[PDB]
From Swiss-Prot:
Lineage, highest ranks first: Eukaryota, Fungi, Dikarya, Ascomycota, Saccharomycotina
Record bears the keyword Metal-binding: no
SUPFAM superfamilies, sorted: Actin depolymerizing proteins (SSF55753)
Protein's name in the database: Cofilin
Domain ADF-H: 1-132
Molecular function via GO: actin filament binding
Organism, as annotated: Saccharomyces cerevisiae (strain ATCC 204508 / S288c)
Amino acid sequence: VAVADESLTAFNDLKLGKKYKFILFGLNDAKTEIVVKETSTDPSYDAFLEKLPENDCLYAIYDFEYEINGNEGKRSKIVFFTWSPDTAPVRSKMVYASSKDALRRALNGVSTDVQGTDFSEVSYDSVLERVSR
């Protein structure tokens, strides 16, 4: 579909400005474009997970910061999440699956990509392992 202008601006603020810790994107009612549904500066990973619709899909961008060690500080990588819970309607999964690339191709700067179908696939530990290793 079309990527709302607002969605790009929000990605750039997070990317160059650290303005938000994470952003939740979704399709509008008209299913014509990808808009931002929520933004947050809340650093707790649990506040992120509590916002993933148990029976629906969405796209998410999270600024994951972790310790690159050797007493060397932290590192931060932008993770793109595709959230398609096993319990979401086949109709939802279908439309999110095909519109994904429209959004994913427009966001320059993403390090990792995570496909989430259940909550354990998006736990702090699974994502840490994926950005670390």
